[PDB]
Ligand binder design. Structure first.
Ligand SMILES: *[C@@H]1O[C@H](CO)[C@@H](O)[C@H](O)[C@H]1NC(C)=O
Length: 536
């Protein structure tokens, strides 16, 4: 139970799920989330865990089972880097909020400070939500967003955010430069969410919030963005698609039970997400009651909802300083562990691939943490929330859905879901079952392909709150998405143009596992027969 709750909650469930829910309503986002967690989330979580635990390799080198698909591991490592770029910036925000939380008069309470606009209006004394003292502290006091007109005109990095990001990358380096990889980081998210839930239900005007949460709008389900949001958040919360699961299972015992691991992680994720949305909407209803505004336009739908929503919940608690310090220490440590997991996925994959990097661990981890620092300097600029939004919507998006779709395809169709079931039976001692095989070979790939094509053809232009990104920003975002999606066909063409022989024996050498290339020469290969593909 401790092992599954330690990683069942991460920075995703606590930071990204609130604004993805609020942006898409109440249960209107919890319906696709649960359907994808049961249909595609849990099966592919269990598939990645079993793959890593059996093959004993990272994300990139696990594809010695089907060599044409190593581009998928390269893609997930690139996605992990891209996501760490702004995870470190979220941790910088957590550090700045924790540092600001060490006073009796919390800064996000009144409008009497130096960062406040002349239009800062607090209820204690039909407006907009950017004129509340909490949103004024987030935008004008932390981000300094008021000094940039858009993603074209981003300023220089923010000094305080620069120091916070330096501290983050330094602690990450000193946490990863020897460690091949705890009670508080695993128990405190749930305790904080429990306190949040109970104090939210006791708040005035939060019943309107929980009703707006429990009201499921099906016209939102008839459109396509809620499903893309739910799929991407499923793969963020569970960690499938960043190479973290395969890298972490590479170190698990051979007899370890990935079935029970996946089951507990997925069930705890579903319950945690439901109660997380419940508490988030309790606070949002309280804010709509306090600010005399509608619930649908009471806060931002960007990445900074938590840093506006949770400070306002804290300011209502008794002993606001203690609870602010506790919540932001929790957020700091949680996102810190998440970013450590991502960077360790990157390092483990690229070190299992190239041994010159496995022998040189300190230099490689310095190069990894120092590349994620220079490219996170863009997200701590004055217009860095626009770059962070671009990355958040494009780094892991259609890209991660495509990567996980190709993982499913390469494990189920080309390697064999029957071979995978035999390997799983060899690890644990029991066959997966019919539901798991039908989801691995047919249900999850079909749902993921549908979500990918719908994510491409139902693309809405990128926006911040009321800021329409220029078209070139959308082109740059699609370049960010394609930079990892093209690794799969590029590597297929590279592996085909680097193997001697005729067409069919090149194909055979590229779809046969590396350890039994002996049988390729004697022409006894499974995938060239029909009984391999008709196995359901
Ligand atoms: C913001 O304050 C400025 C002060 O000159 C002025 O534009 C107005 O009072 C406020 N703007 C809006 C849109 O309320």
């Amino acid at each position: 139970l401790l092992s599954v709750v330690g990683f069942a909650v991460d920075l995703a469930n606590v930071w990204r799920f609130p604004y993805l829910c609020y942006k898409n309503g109440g249960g209107a986002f919890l319906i696709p989330y649960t359907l994808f967690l049961i249909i595609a989330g849990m099966p592919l979580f269990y598939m990645e865990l079993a793959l890593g635990q059996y093959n004993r390799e990272g994300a990139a080198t696990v594809w010695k089972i089907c060599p044409f698909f190593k581009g998928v591991g390269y893609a997930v490592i690139l996605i992990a880097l891209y996501v760490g770029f702004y995870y470190n910036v979220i941790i910088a925000w957590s550090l700045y909020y924790l540092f600001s939380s060490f006073t009796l008069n919390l800064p996000w309470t009144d409008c009497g400070h130096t960062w406040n606009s002349p239009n800062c209006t607090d209820p204690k004394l039909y407006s907009k939500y950017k004129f509340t003292p909490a949103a004024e502290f987030y935008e004008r006091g932390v981000l300094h967003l008021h000094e940039s007109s858009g993603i074209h005109d981003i300023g220089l990095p923010q000094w305080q955010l620069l120091l916070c990001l330096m501290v983050v990358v330094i602690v990450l380096y000193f946490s990863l430069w020897k460690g091949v990889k705890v009670w508080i980081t695993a128990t405190l998210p749930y305790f904080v969410l429990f306190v949040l839930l109970v104090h939210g239900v006791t708040l005035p005007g939060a019943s309107n919030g929980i009703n707006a949460y429990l009201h499921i709008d099906f016209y939102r389900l008839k459109e396509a963005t809620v499903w893309i949001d739910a799929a991407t958040q499923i793969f963020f919360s569970l960690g499938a698609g960043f190479g973290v699961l395969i890298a972490f299972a590479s170190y698990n015992k051979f007899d370890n039970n990935c079935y029970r691991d996946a089951l507990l992680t997925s069930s705890i994720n579903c319950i945690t997400s439901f109660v997380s949305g419940f508490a988030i909407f309790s606070i949002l209803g309280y804010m709509a009651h306090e600010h005399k505004v509608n619930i649908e336009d009471v806060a931002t739908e960007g990445a900074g909802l938590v840093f506006i929503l949770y400070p306002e919940a804290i300011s209502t608690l008794s002993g606001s300083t203690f609870w602010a310090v506790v919540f932001f220490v929790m957020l700091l440590a949680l996102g810190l562990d998440s970013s450590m997991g991502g960077m360790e996925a990157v390092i483990t994959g690229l070190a299992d691939d190239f041994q010159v990097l496995k022998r040189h661990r300190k230099l490689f981890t310095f190069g990894v943490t120092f590349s994620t620092f220079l490219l996170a300097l863009f997200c701590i600029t004055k217009g860095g929330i626009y770059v962070l939004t671009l990355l958040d919507t494009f780094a892991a998006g259609t890209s991660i859905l495509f990567a996980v779709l190709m993982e499913a395809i390469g494990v189920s169709w080309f390697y064999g879901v029957d071979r995978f079931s035999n390997d799983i039976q060899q690890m644990m001692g029991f066959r997966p079952g019919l539901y798991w095989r039908l989801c691995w070979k047919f249900v999850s790939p079909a749902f993921l392909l549908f979500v990918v094509v719908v994510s491409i053809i139902n693309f809405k232009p990128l926006t911040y709150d009321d800021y329409i990104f220029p078209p070139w920003a959308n082109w740059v975002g699609w370049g960010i998405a394609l930079s990892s999606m093209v690794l799969v066909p590029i590597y297929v063409i590279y592996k085909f143009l680097s193997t001697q022989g005729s067409l069919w024996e090149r194909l055979a050498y590229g779809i046969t596992p590396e350890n039994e290339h002996h049988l390729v020469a004697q022409r006894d290969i499974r995938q060239f027969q029909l009984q391999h593909w008709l196995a359901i």
